[PDB]
From a paper:
Our recent discovery of meditope, a cyclic peptide that binds to a Fab cavity of cetuximab, can serve as an alternative, noncovalent method to modify antibodies, with a precise ratio of two meditopes to one IgG. We have also determined important residues emanating from the Fab through systematically grafting the binding site onto M5A, an anti-CEA mAb. In this report, we investigate the possibility of increasing the affinity of this interaction by reaching through to the other side of the Fab hole. Our recent efforts to characterize and optimize the affinity of the meditope–Fab complex focused on the importance of cyclization and side-chain modifications. In these structural analyses, we observed that the guanidinium nitrogen (NH2) of arginine in position 8, located in the ‘back’ of the meditope-binding pocket, is partially exposed to the other side of the Fab. We wondered whether it was possible to reach through the other side of the Fab hole by extending the side chain of Arg8, increasing the surface area to improve the affinity of the meditope–Fab interaction.
Given that the addition of the extended hydrophobic groups did not improve the affinity, we investigated the possibility of adding polar groups that can participate in hydrogen bonds. We observed in the structure that the terminal methyl group is in close proximity to the backbone carbonyl of Gly112 HC (3.3 Å for the first copy of the meditope in the asymmetric unit and 3.5 Å for the second) and the backbone amide of Leu114 HC (∼3.3 Å); thus, we expected that modification of this group with a hydrogen-bond donor or acceptor could improve the affinity. In each case we preserved the original length of the main chain of the n-butyl group (four atoms).
Author numbering:
A (entry chain A): 1 to 212
B (entry chain F): 2 to 11
C (entry chain B): 1 to 220
The structure:
Amino acid sequence: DILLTQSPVILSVSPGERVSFSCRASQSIGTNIHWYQQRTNGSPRLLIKYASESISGIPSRFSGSGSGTDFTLSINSVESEDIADYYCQQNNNWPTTFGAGTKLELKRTVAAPSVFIFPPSDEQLKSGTASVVCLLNNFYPREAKVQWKVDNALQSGNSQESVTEQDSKDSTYSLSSTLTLSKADYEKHKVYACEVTHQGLSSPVTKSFNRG
Amino acid sequence: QFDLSTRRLK
Amino acid sequence: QVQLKQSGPGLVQPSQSLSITCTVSGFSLTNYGVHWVRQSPGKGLEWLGVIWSGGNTDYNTPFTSRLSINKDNSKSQVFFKMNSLQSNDTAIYYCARALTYYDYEFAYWGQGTLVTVSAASTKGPSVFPLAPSSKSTSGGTAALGCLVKDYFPEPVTVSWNSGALTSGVHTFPAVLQSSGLYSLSSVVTVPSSSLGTQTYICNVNHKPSNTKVDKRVEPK
């Protein structure tokens, strides 16, 4: 099978820059390469066929070039809606094979997170478990620290984090940290605090509530 | 690696 | 409009078999071949096989012995079946159609079926409100959400107000808990002055367990 090698694995650029994806084939394939876009939670979208031929409905800023073994997909002016993974496909040799893909990340200005905290619902407490959720909304860049404290006891190992993919409209990230306690432990304590560190904040932000 | 939850590379 | 609509996601026990239906519209199966592609964490996008206009099938070499593709032209249905599944067969499976009847440049894709291979059992989620309050309000904006806890397997669909509310929605990727069950939250920001007039409902659909919950989220 043809091995397709896409490089690099991640591309980070600023809006309006030109950007180029590379696809190298393990032996000559002429111009028998197609390019695909995959957005968050999407199916692959066909961008270019046969190295450089355009596709109806695809913005003009997409173009491809190359022949033999070395191929290039180009975006002349990146928009935030271009945040996606990009894959190349060869079909000069059965079976058709795909590259492993390149991720296109976008830069933007530092944006501090908005921080919200949610106590557990009385509904969940009936079931015997308590989830406390801390939300970090629409921030950049992705790096942040979330630290939980219960009655000034530092929590460690009983929280999980999830981060959305990059927003295709405004290039921010959002993060949830969920602290999970038993109902008994939760009822045994009063002050629940989420403390947040991020480049866009000049001092840490603590959001907190007293149970009750 | 490709992530089944988001369909994106992680 | 060319479309390909695949059956829904679900769990398949190891060693058991996989079955997906792809229903097409906007073209006839007697004129185009229908291809099957999958996307795994292990191998990324792999081409699996194709059933051609006239019934012939090709299968990618590693799959010829456990893969079968059939179709019903009258019903516009293509059937994908794969035997003896193991855990690294956990993937999103897609049906696709090329630009021309004989080619392989896939301009039309199904939405993809996420198949999980695992010995576990199907569990529907519990849905708990993440209620707006002072502790989630800032400069006229209130955040609120739904906690979608303890289900298996992926995925779950979450929407807000039956699709009419999409702006400012963030549905976080599921995380796997030590229990082996997934959990996620979905949040949205709204004007805090709308909390007394507008109702906010997260529509939760966990198709592998046929669990549909509409959770009304209220200021506490």
